[PDB]
Design a binder for this molecule. Structure first.
Ligand SMILES: *[C@@H]1O[C@H](CO)[C@@H](O[C@@H]2O[C@H](CO)[C@@H](O)[C@H](O)[C@H]2NC(C)=O)[C@H](O)[C@H]1NC(C)=O
Lengths: 36, 50
């Protein structure tokens, strides 16, 4: 993977994305469209 | 023995058949060389950069 070129890691890890999705899903279960 | 390159040497656990000289993976990238004196397989790693 190292021959003259590099790969940069993503800024957002997978756990943070999962946490965002969980927050959105809980919000849409409880409140509905009001929290938007 | 005529194959030149740059990197860092280390020990390797791969096993060669009794007649090959040196291995590779893809795109002419050497990855395993055996010293003629010891008949032991070594390993090449590119030096760190960034
Ligand atoms: C290079 O070849 C010599 C032979 O001329 C090897 O020397 C022998 O090595 C074995 C393994 O240790 C010993 O059992 C023998 O007694 C050695 N014989 C002599 C005459 O030295 C040597 O090991 C080989 N490799 C290197 C790195 O020198």
């Amino acid at each position: 993977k190292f021959n003259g070129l590099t790969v940069l890691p993503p800024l957002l890890t997978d756990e943070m994305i999962a946490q965002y999705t969980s927050a959105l899903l809980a919000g849409t279960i409880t409140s509905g469209w009001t929290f938007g | 023995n005529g194959l030149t390159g740059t990197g860092v040497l280390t020990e390797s656990n791969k096993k060669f058949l009794p007649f090959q000289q040196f291995g590779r993976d893809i795109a002419d990238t050497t990855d395993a060389v055996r010293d003629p004196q010891t008949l032991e397989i070594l390993d090449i790693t590119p030096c760190s950069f960034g």
